[PDB]
């Protein structure tokens, strides 16, 4: 596939892009009352883990799955809402706004670091081809 460091850094870039996408989706839908099924929007989170199957300890990053948070959803009192339960409570997303903002910034920073890694590896591989003129 992508040689070696190429594959590692590309996997890292894809994973961090997925994480930033999840953070942006959480930030956008912080005030959503419902979804298509009538269920509240639950904050999504990616799961990062290494991928070093052929007998290695280090192989990069891959996103195993996207999981919805189990933190208790926020209950707001609204008896006129069609989605209200028997007690008149409506469930609202458990998004942590500051957490998602910090996630956006950190994902951008590590994405940029991996960009710098891949660019440097390319440079070094470009010089290698001139070994002994």
């Amino acid at each position: 596939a992508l040689l070696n460091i190429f594959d590692i850094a590309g996997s890292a870039l894809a994973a961090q892009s997925k994480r930033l996408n999840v953070a942006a989706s959480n930030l956008a839908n912080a005030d959503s009352v419902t979804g298509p099924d009538g269920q509240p929007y639950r904050a999504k989170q990616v799961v990062f883990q290494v991928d070093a199957a052929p007998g290695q300890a280090t192989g990069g990053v891959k996103v195993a799955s996207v999981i919805e948070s189990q933190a208790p959803e926020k209950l707001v009192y609204e008896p006129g809402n069609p989605l209200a339960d028997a007690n008149g409570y409506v469930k609202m997303p458990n998004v942590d706004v500051v957490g998602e903002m910090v996630n956006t910034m950190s994902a951008s920073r590590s994405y940029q670091a991996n960009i710098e890694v891949l660019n440097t590896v390319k440079s070094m591989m470009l010089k290698t081809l001139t070994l002994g003129q």
């Binding site: 596939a1 894809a14 298509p36």
Partner: peptide
């Protein structure tokens, strides 16, 4: 279907329906 791999069959068309049906 591992992401980033190559598959013979094309990807199914995605859909974003606003209500349920």
């Amino acid at each position: 279907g591992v992401p980033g791999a190559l598959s013979n069959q094309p990807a199914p068309p995605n859909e974003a329906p606003i209500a349920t049906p």
